[PDB]
Curated annotation (Swiss-Prot):
GO terms for biological process: acetylcholine catabolic process; choline metabolic process; cocaine metabolic process; learning; negative regulation of cell population proliferation; negative regulation of synaptic transmission; neuroblast differentiation; peptide hormone processing. This is Cholinesterase. It is an enzyme of class 3 (hydrolase). It comes from Homo sapiens (Human). The gene is BCHE. Tacrine binds at W80, H436.
């Protein structure tokens, strides 16, 4: 029986056996007032003390969100769907601590991804108990509001200021600052890490003055705020808030009573209309996401990054080899997870219309021209592979690389990785390759469980990644120093060295996707 006393009251955890050892888990600790009733769409309010012992012995509700129902019964998609009840009462966090209790452990705080419309910290691939057992770090993860409930914005209006889910994350970071020492953690050694929208979130905490003193270092897996999906413009945010009001019967003239009207709708009526606040959506649509609110984000983040207005610290950034393929089977013509999706030139052109609907005819031709002048027109999977690279380069890889360059130009050590091992357990077909999101299970150490049908080379790869991530968090340097591993060089603006992560051979390479990213970052923002 382990009870910990926090600033807000006592919490009871539970003991878990992990790799012939023990981890202490506190699942579902509240860190904010439930954002219900008048508090819906508002910034999270701090919680006041309770007198009892809070039982943190099960994961809490996930925040309200739409669910991926495209492939019912299929593990590849359903593994990302929430695994606890949905509720507006969802502002909870989880803490895993090593046993015996550490004295001053480094803390890793996980921010789940998605595209800011979905996600939960209770997923099996985010289970922090393996990291706490293997590296003796403390792992924290939180639920934050998503979709309209998390990011509805009438900027300037405190009834719906925008960025509320980013403020949920920030309040959980404050909870760690104020409470983690009682669990044996060091509030001065806190590393944020996250994937996709969680990584874009981490990159925004690097820009936010209110988050500056809440963490030490950052890790960005397959995402950053400069990705084209990550930040909603002021005008676009307003049109979407008003479009949602029309679709729910809440169109008023005083915008403050628009919000009051939306505060009396049931969560499900808001959820069902979220998809339609935009005329043409894509599999990468982020209908309600971060905005420049003048509070969490004081200016357009591209400007802040360009001019060096961010927390000066070390960063670890990387991407997967086939970021773009996961999105193709959700709309692109001729694509299917159940065949090898050999598509034609004409289908490739139709896919560009799917993924770039608001782009001029000339813009789409420029993508076609750059990605289709190949070696031989013999290979039949040419167009299939080109469309995936198009989606992956534009949405993840080139923004990650440009974020790392601009960040490193102001003096800090940066480390960039290229993850290129396809999980032996990956439920999606082989043509989709090293998919978006499938490095996560290696980072959380799932292949260290021998009972779970991963290869031995995958156990070794995950063990090395876990050590590199933990050494980055503890010491700012993602090395595996004991088992003669390839040394990971800093990424610099000139050389742009990066480390490849695979089961075969660990290599140092330079200037990833150099030609493609010149197209996307220099030319394409003009179209
Ligand atoms: C701002 O919103 C308008 C309206 O969107 C319509 O109303 C919403 C409630 C929702 O139902 C949307 O799906 C609707 O599209 C957008 O306008 C439309 O634009 C398309 C093509 O641009 C056109 O074919 C429609 O006729 C337009 N409909 C109306 C009512 O104007 C408009 O594009 C949005 N603005 C931005 C910048 O995205
Ligand atoms: C690969 O499949 C796509 C998707 O089609 C579906 O999934 C298949 C496995 C099969 O169960 C089909 O019945 C499904 O339609 C195929 O694209 C479809 O092609 C048909 C041609 O008859 C067309 O009518 C549909 O509109 C297409 N659907 C989409 C989403 O594009 C594609 O042709 C298959 N490629 C192969 C077998 O190489
Ligand atoms: C590691 N992740 C957790 C995996 C899940 N995925 C990626 C897929 C990409 C294509 C399909 N959809 C689903 C999400 C969803 C939810 C309700 C109804 C329909 C659909 C389509 C998710 C995401 O959560 C995800 C979702 C949106 C994104 C938008 C921009 C950039 C990245 C994005 C990543
Ligand atoms: C897509 N264009 C780039 C959006 C630019 N704007 C919006 C700001 C805020 C509203 C007023 N001005 C000026 C711009 C201009 C130019 C000539 C004449 C009048 C005006 C109005 C534009 C933002 O990027 C934005 C949005 C919200 C913010 C909130 C706090 C601080 C800064 C913020 C910045
Ligand atoms: C815990 O350690 C604190 C110092 O920690 C660290 O210092 C900061 C600057 C970062 O460099 C971290 O990565 C270091 O690990 C002490 O100030 C504190 O007293 C200690 N508390 C204990 C031992 O209870
Ligand atoms: C918390 O859990 C313990 C389990 O040992 C139980 O004794 C106690 O009644 C619980 N408190 C609740 C459910 O409020
Ligand atoms: C809108 O309504 C709110 C709520 O009653 C009120 O506080 C505010 O002053 C009103 N503003 C305008 C411009 O009508
Ligand atoms: C280092 O190699 C040893 C085998 O000698 C292995 O047991 C250990 O897990 C490895 N550690 C890391 C961090 O790879
Ligand atoms: Cl109310
Ligand atoms: Cl043509
Ligand atoms: Cl070179």
């Amino acid at each position: 029986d382990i009870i910990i006393a926090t600033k807000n009251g006592k919490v009871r955890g539970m003991q878990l056996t992990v790799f012939g050892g023990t981890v202490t888990a506190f699942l579902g600790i509240p860190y904010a007032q439930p954002p219900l009733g008048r508090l819906r769409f508002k910034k999270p309010q701090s919680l006041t003390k309770w007198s009892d012992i809070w039982n943190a012995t099960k994961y809490a509700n996930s925040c309200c969100q739409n669910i991926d129902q495209s492939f019912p019964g299929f593990h590849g998609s359903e593994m990302w769907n929430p695994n606890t009840d949905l509720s507006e009462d969802c502002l909870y966090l989880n803490v895993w601590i090593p046993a015996p209790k550490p004295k001053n452990a480094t803390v890793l705080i996980w921010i789940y991804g998605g595209g800011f419309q979905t996600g939960t910290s209770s997923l099996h691939v985010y289970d922090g108990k393996f990291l706490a057992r293997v590296e003796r770090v403390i792992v924290v993860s939180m639920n934050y509001r998503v979709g309209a409930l998390g990011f509805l914005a009438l900027p300037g209006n405190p009834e719906a200021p925008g960025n509320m889910g980013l403020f949920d994350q920030q309040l959980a970071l404050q909870w760690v600052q104020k409470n983690i020492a009682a669990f044996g953690g060091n509030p001065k050694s806190v590393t944020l890490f996250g994937e996709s929208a969680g990584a874009a979130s981490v990159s925004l905490h690097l820009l936010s003055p209110g988050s500056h003193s809440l963490f030490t270092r950052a890790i960005l897996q397959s995402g950053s705020f400069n990705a084209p999906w990550a930040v909603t413009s002021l005008y676009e945010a307003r049109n979407r808030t008003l479009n949602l009001a029309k679709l729910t019967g809440c169109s008023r003239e005083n915008e403050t009573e628009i919000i009051k009207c939306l505060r009396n709708k049931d969560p499900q009526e808001i959820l069902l209309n979220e998809a339609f606040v935009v005329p043409y959506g894509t599999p990468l649509s982020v209908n309600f996401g971060p905005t420049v609110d003048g509070d969490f984000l004081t200016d357009m983040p591209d400007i802040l990054l360009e001019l060096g207005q961010f927390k000066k610290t070390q960063i670890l950034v990387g991407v997967n080899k086939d970021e773009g393929t996961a999105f193709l089977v959700y709309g692109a013509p001729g694509f299917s997870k159940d065949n090898n999706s050999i598509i034609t030139r004409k289908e490739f052109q139709e896919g560009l219309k799917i993924f770039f609907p608001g782009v001029s005819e000339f813009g789409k031709e420029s993508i076609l021209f750059h990605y289709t002048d190949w070696v031989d027109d013999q290979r039949p999977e040419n167009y299939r592979e080109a469309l995936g690279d198009v989606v992956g380069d534009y949405n993840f890889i080139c923004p990650a690389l440009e974020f790392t360059k601009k960040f490193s130009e102001w003096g800090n050590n940066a480390f960039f990785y290229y993850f290129e091992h396809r999980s032996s357990k990956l439920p999606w077909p082989e043509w989709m390759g090293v998919m978006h999101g499938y490095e996560i299970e290696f980072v959380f150490g799932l292949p260290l469980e021998r009972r779970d049908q991963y290869t031995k080379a995958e156990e070794i790869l995950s063990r090395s990644i876990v050590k590199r991530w933990a050494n980055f968090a503890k010491y700012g340097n993602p090395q595996e120093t004991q088992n003669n591993s390839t040394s990971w060089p800093v990424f610099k603006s000139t050389e742009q060295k990066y480390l490849t992560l695979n089961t075969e051979s660990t290599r140092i390479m330079t200037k990833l996707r150099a030609q493609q990213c010149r197209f996307w970052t220099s030319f394409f923002p003009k179209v």
